[PDB]
Symmetry: C3
Subunit: 132 residues, 3 copies
């Protein structure tokens, strides 16, 4: 199988409620058709090891940015960014995860707000490394 996605958000996300999934409207690639832009979820099509990377730019507001990489309902890794000016700042992390078919991987906006524009600062990608 060839499975890879690379997504970006081109409009801000500032929902007004904590702990929301982050949709990504734009895709550069979606090999395998397993990323869903509206929900922001990647669905595992085949048990195996997958690599994920994300970079999220915060709005220049005095609220810190907290991002979680979720697998189903579990926090796998997290990222923090804040600047007191307040200026933009970037919350980023990565993971290599063992997934089972049907598992979903997604980013949660725990706190803060996300910058989106056509220059695609805020991104989320993943790819299949080893298929079972």
């Amino acid at each position: 199988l060839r499975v890879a996605f690379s997504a970006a958000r081109t409009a801000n996300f500032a929902p007004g409620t904590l702990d929301q999934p982050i949709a990504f409207d734009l895709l550069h690639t979606n090999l395998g058709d397993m990323f869903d832009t509206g929900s922001g979820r990647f669905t595992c099509p085949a048990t195996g090891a997958y690599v994920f990377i994300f970079h999220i730019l915060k709005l220049a507001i005095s609220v810190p940015l907290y991002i979680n990489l979720m697998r189903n309902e579990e926090v796998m890794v997290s990222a923090y960014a804040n600047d007191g000016a307040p200026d933009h700042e970037t919350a980023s992390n990565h993971a290599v995860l063992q997934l089972f078919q049907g598992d979903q991987v997604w980013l949660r906006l725990h706190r803060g707000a996300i910058y989106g524009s056509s220059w695609k600062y805020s991104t989320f990608s993943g790819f299949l490394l080893y298929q079972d």
Copy 2:
């Protein structure tokens, strides 16, 4: 094909004109010989999906750092970093891109200035994920 590069800049880049390509003088790997240090460009040797990652440390000056990952003449993803002290800060992003043979991928210094030293803070890498 085996295609992968991992480059670093070991001297500062502060050109004095906006929107300049970023050369990377040092290579840890250049499997496939497709990265050119002088131009900072990766040339696609075979249509396929490629992964790119970059981390760029800014000079501690009161000019923000804006980096674009370019494919040919198009902005694919971007990164921002700034600190008001001013301190060093890091502009980073990644992408998984569908490339065609002959396409070129490179980093553009939109604004700001880059820190280079022998400890290799400022880096740019890529590798072939799926060959067509």
Copy 3:
């Protein structure tokens, strides 16, 4: 061979001596059994090209964070993070390295202190790209 690890630190690291290796207590994956949590070292099981990524969150103290990605006793790439508030900040980088069997890759805390918690902000991963 299938070789990949993805580690996180869930407790702080503030050793009180500069230039210390960083242990990572938690693993999401350790395909090939080549990451050692206590030493923080990945041992190369087979000559080839390997990808490494790390994201390290600093303690909110007025000491900057400097991280080196080491191969044996050599600095390969480095990362810096600091914020004057002082706030948390993230030191991150990546590399694609040609390794020989027996080589060890690890992260060095040059200066600063690392934040660890159950939300897994501070991470280190690697995987085999091309086996010789």
